[PDB]
Design an enzyme around this catalytic site. Structure first.
Site, mmCIF file in Angstrom:
data_model
loop_
_atom_site.group_PDB
_atom_site.id
_atom_site.type_symbol
_atom_site.label_atom_id
_atom_site.label_comp_id
_atom_site.label_asym_id
_atom_site.label_seq_id
_atom_site.Cartn_x
_atom_site.Cartn_y
_atom_site.Cartn_z
ATOM 1 N N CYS A 160 0.843 -1.173 0.000
ATOM 2 C CA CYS A 160 0.000 0.000 0.000
ATOM 3 C C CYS A 160 0.893 1.244 0.000
ATOM 4 O O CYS A 160 1.976 1.316 0.591
ATOM 5 C CB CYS A 160 -1.030 -0.069 1.110
ATOM 6 S SG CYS A 160 -1.917 1.481 1.571
ATOM 7 N N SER A 168 0.724 4.010 1.509
ATOM 8 C CA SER A 168 1.160 4.524 2.795
ATOM 9 C C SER A 168 2.443 3.844 3.264
ATOM 10 O O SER A 168 3.109 4.511 4.148
ATOM 11 C CB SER A 168 0.156 4.470 3.911
ATOM 12 O OG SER A 168 -1.110 4.957 3.615
ATOM 13 N N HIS A 214 5.250 5.998 1.857
ATOM 14 C CA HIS A 214 5.361 7.310 2.495
ATOM 15 C C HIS A 214 6.389 7.193 3.611
ATOM 16 O O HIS A 214 7.199 8.110 3.771
ATOM 17 C CB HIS A 214 4.084 7.962 3.069
ATOM 18 C CG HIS A 214 3.029 8.214 2.071
ATOM 19 N ND1 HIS A 214 1.696 7.881 2.245
ATOM 20 C CD2 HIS A 214 3.115 8.782 0.829
ATOM 21 C CE1 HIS A 214 1.028 8.220 1.148
ATOM 22 N NE2 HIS A 214 1.876 8.773 0.312
ATOM 23 N N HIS A 247 1.003 -3.207 6.515
ATOM 24 C CA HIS A 247 -0.156 -3.149 7.446
ATOM 25 C C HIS A 247 -1.364 -3.748 6.849
ATOM 26 O O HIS A 247 -2.488 -3.964 7.421
ATOM 27 C CB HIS A 247 -0.360 -1.637 7.929
ATOM 28 C CG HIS A 247 -0.610 -0.743 6.749
ATOM 29 N ND1 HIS A 247 0.342 -0.098 6.030
ATOM 30 C CD2 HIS A 247 -1.759 -0.470 6.097
ATOM 31 C CE1 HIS A 247 -0.140 0.585 5.031
ATOM 32 N NE2 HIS A 247 -1.419 0.375 5.050
ATOM 33 N N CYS A 303 -6.766 -3.031 4.255
ATOM 34 C CA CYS A 303 -6.537 -1.619 3.961
ATOM 35 C C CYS A 303 -7.286 -1.173 2.711
ATOM 36 O O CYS A 303 -8.420 -0.719 2.777
ATOM 37 C CB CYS A 303 -5.039 -1.296 3.824
ATOM 38 S SG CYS A 303 -4.871 0.559 3.836
HETATM 39 ZN ZN LIG Z 1 -2.927 1.249 3.520
#
Ligand SMILES: [Zn+2]
Ligand SMILES: [Zn+2]
Ligand SMILES: [Zn+2]
Ligand SMILES: [Zn+2]
Lengths: 374, 374
Positions: free
Chosen positions: A46, A48, A51, A67, A174
Site C-alpha cells: 500500500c 502509505s 510514504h 499493514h 486496507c
Molecule cells: Zn494502507
C-alpha cells in the site's frame, strides 16, 4: 515448537529513509499478555508504506513496515480470548480497544489506542518485540507485516473465516475496506443515486464496488488515464470521463451530466485541487463529498465556504469508517458469499523476497495491487 | 375594498448602493395567479439586508429589501389554496415549490425556485409588482418586506397560527429558524452532547436554544464580547469563554475543556479563521461542524484536509435546513406551546418610518434584534 520462545525469520527492515528494504534476519519475541503472534501468508503493498520510505509519514526508524495482510495465528499470550493458534486473521492498522470515547460512539472508528496520530512504533506497552542482531526494530501501526512473523496486540487483530483465501482477503486489511466503506458507510450511498469517483486506482475501484453494492444508479469514474477505465467499468463504473478531453472544467462537465450535480463524490487520489473540484461537482443542496485519503505531507487547500452554505456535506475517514474488529470478519463473510470479487484488483503476486521490486511497480506506475506471498 | 386593485402605501426603497432607505410612496399591483398580497405587521432587520446596501450581496436596484417578517393576507390571486384573506402568514425567503429535485429530496431545502443564487429581483413570472411614480421597483428574494404591502408567490408564503403575536414570531422568518435549525436539523445535536457556538449574536442565541431543545449537556458560547455572555446563559449556554483572556488558541483551550473536543461546533459569525477554528475544536473521530452563515463577499479559506481525514463532518445550510413551508407553521406551534421563548432576542422595537435608525443600531453594535412595526 516455537509456541513459547523467540523466533528467527526474515523481515524487510528500513534502516534509513529513502533506502530500499533490507531482507534481514531478525528475532521475534514471544507474545506478552494480550499479544498474539502471527505467521504471515501474504501482505499487500500500500501507498502509505512508501510514504514511510520517503520520510513523508514520520515514524521511528528503523522499522518494519506493512499493514495490509492476512495470516495464521502461531501463539497467543496470556489473557487472549478472541483468537486461537491456527485461526485465520487479519491484523488491524486501526485498533478496536472497545472502550475509548471513540469505540463506544456509534459512528466513530478511529480508536484512540492507534499509533498513527503520534507514532511511537511500539506495542501498547511501549516495547518492541523485534531485534536485528542486538538492535531493537520498531513496529509499524501495531502491525509490521513485512515480516515472516509479527506480534500484534489483541485489539489489533481480527479472526476471519477459516476457509478464506488469505492471498486475496489480505485486501480487506486496507485498500479494499478503505474504498468500499467510504461508499457504504461514510457517504452512505443510497439506491438510484449518481456518484463520481476521482481516481481509478485500487481504493478507487473499491469505492465503485461499494457504490454498486449500495445500489447507485450511475457511477462516473474520473481519471486522466484512459487505460484505467476498463477495470472501472468491469467493476461497476457506468461511465468514465477523461478531464483531459474537455475544453472546460470537469466540475462543469460533471455538473451538466448529472443535471445539477452528483449525489456523492469521492476524491480517492489525495490531490488538493481535486478535493475542491469533487466538492463542487456535488448537488449544492444535498450533495455529500468524501475524501478517502490525503498524503501525510499535505498542505492547506484553498476553498470558498460558500460551497457548504447551500447544503453540501464534506467528510473524511480512516479505514472506510469501519469499526475494525467488528467489520473485518463481515467483509470476509460477504466475500465468501460471492457478494463482491477481489481478483480484479490483484495485478501482481511476487514472492516476498522481491519486496523492493513490488515498490517499483507501485512507485512508477500501473500496479493496481501487488500481493507479497511468504 | 382594495381586494382587486392597486394599493398605495409607503415602502423603504434603496435607489442606490450605500445610500439610506428612502421612505417613498409606491403602488402595489393586485396579485396575479398564485400570488398573495399581504399587509405587513412587523419586519425584523437582518444582517443580510444591510449587505444589499453595501453592494456585497448583488441584486437588481432599485429594490425593496427585507425578508424576515410576519403579516396578514389582504387578497389572493387565482388558483391560491393555502391562504385566505385574513390569515396570519410569514413570507418565505427560501421557497417550497414542492416539485424540484430539492423539494422532493428528504433533506434538501434550498428550493430551486429561489432568487438568491442568480438574483432577478422579480416575481416567478419575471415581473415586478411595484412602481414608484411610473418607475418599476425590484423585489427582494420573493419577499420585499420593507413595505406596508407586498406581493409574494404562493410557494413563498406560510400560513401560521391565528393567535400568533406577529411582532414576535416574525423572527421565525430568518434569524431564529436559521440558528435553531442548525442545531436541531443540520447538526442534529443529540442528548448529553457538548457543543461550541462561535458568535453570541441573535442567530447565535438561536443555535443555543436549538442545542438545548435538542438536549445537549453542555454549551460553550464563544465571543470576544463579555457583554454578550448573560443572555447566552439565560437562553442556555452552560459556559462562556472569551478567547481574549487565554494565552493560547481557543481550539486548544476548547479541545482541553471538552476532553478531546466538542460533539458539534457552530460558526455563527461568518469569519474565515473562525470557520477553521470551529472545525478543529471538534472531536476528530466523529465531530460535526456547522457553518451558519458566510458573508456574500467571502473569500477562500485556507485549511488542511487532514482535519476531515480522521472522521469529522463539515456542513452548511440556508434557513436552518428547514423545508420552509412545512416547518414555519411548526415553529409557531411550538412557540405557541410555550416550548421556546423569543423575547430575549428582541432588543429593539422601532416604528417602521425609522428604518435607517434600525440599520444604525445594527451596523455599529449591540442590537440583538430590531423589529420594525407597521
Ligand atoms: Zn494502507
Ligand atoms: Zn478504542
Ligand atoms: Zn422546490
Ligand atoms: Zn436573514
Amino acid at each position: 515448537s516455537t509456541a513459547g520462545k523467540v523466533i528467527k525469520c526474515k523481515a524487510a527492515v528500513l534502516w534509513e529513509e529513502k533506502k530500499p528494504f533490507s531482507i534481514e534476519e531478525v528475532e521475534v519475541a514471544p507474545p506478552k499478555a494480550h499479544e498474539v503472534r502471527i505467521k504471515m501468508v501474504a501482505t499487500g503493498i500500500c501507498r502509505s508504506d512508501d510514504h514511510v520510505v520517503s520520510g513523508t509519514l514520520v515514524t521511528p526508524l528503523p522499522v518494519i513496515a506493512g499493514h495490509e495482510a492476512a495470516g495464521i495465528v502461531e501463539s497467543i499470550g496470556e489473557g487472549v480470548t478472541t483468537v486461537r493458534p491456527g485461526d485465520k486473521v487479519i491484523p488491524l492498522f486501526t485498533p478496536q480497544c472497545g472502550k475509548c470515547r471513540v469505540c463506544k460512539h456509534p459512528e466513530g472508528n478511529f480508536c484512540l489506542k492507534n499509533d498513527l496520530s503520534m507514532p511511537r512504533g511500539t506495542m501498547q506497552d511501549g516495547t518492541s518485540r523485534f531485534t536485528c542482531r542486538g538492535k531493537p526494530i520498531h513496529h509499524f501501526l501495531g502491525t509490521s507485516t513485512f515480516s515472516q512473523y509479527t506480534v500484534v496486540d489483541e485489539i489489533s487483530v481480527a479472526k476471519i473465516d477459516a476457509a478464506s483465501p488469505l492471498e486475496k482477503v489480505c485486501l480487506i486489511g486496507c485498500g479494499f475496506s478503505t474504498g468500499y466503506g467510504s461508499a457504504v458507510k461514510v457517504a452512505k450511498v443510497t439506491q438510484g443515486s449518481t456518484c463520481a469517483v476521482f481516481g481509478l486506482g485500487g481504493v478507487g475501484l473499491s469505492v465503485i464496488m461499494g457504490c454498486k453494492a449500495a445500489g447507485a444508479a450511475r457511477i462516473i469514474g474520473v481519471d486522466i488515464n484512459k487505460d484505467k477505465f476498463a477495470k472501472a467499468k468491469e467493476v461497476g463504473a457506468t461511465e468514465c470521463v477523461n478531464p483531459q478531453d474537455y475544453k472546460k472544467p470537469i466540475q462543469e462537465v460533471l455538473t451538466e451530466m448529472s443535471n445539477g450535480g452528483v449525489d456523492f463524490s469521492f476524491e480517492v487520489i489525495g490531490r488538493l485541487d481535486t478535493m475542491v473540484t469533487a466538492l463542487s461537482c456535488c448537488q449544492e443542496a444535498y450533495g455529500v463529498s468524501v475524501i478517502v485519503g490525503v498524503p501525510p505531507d499535505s498542505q492547506n487547500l484553498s476553498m470558498n465556504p460558500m460551497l457548504l452554505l447551500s447544503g453540501r456535506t464534506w467528510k473524511g475517514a480512516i479505514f472506510g469508517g469501519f469499526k475494525s474488529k467488528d467489520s473485518v470478519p463481515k467483509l470476509v463473510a460477504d466475500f465468501m458469499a460471492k457478494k463482491f470479487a477481489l481478483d480484479p484488483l490483484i495485478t501482481h503476486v511476487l514472492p516476498f523476497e522481491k519486496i523492493n521490486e513490488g515498490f517499483d511497480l507501485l512507485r512508477s506506475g500501473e500496479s493496481i495491487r501487488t500481493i507479497l506471498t511468504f
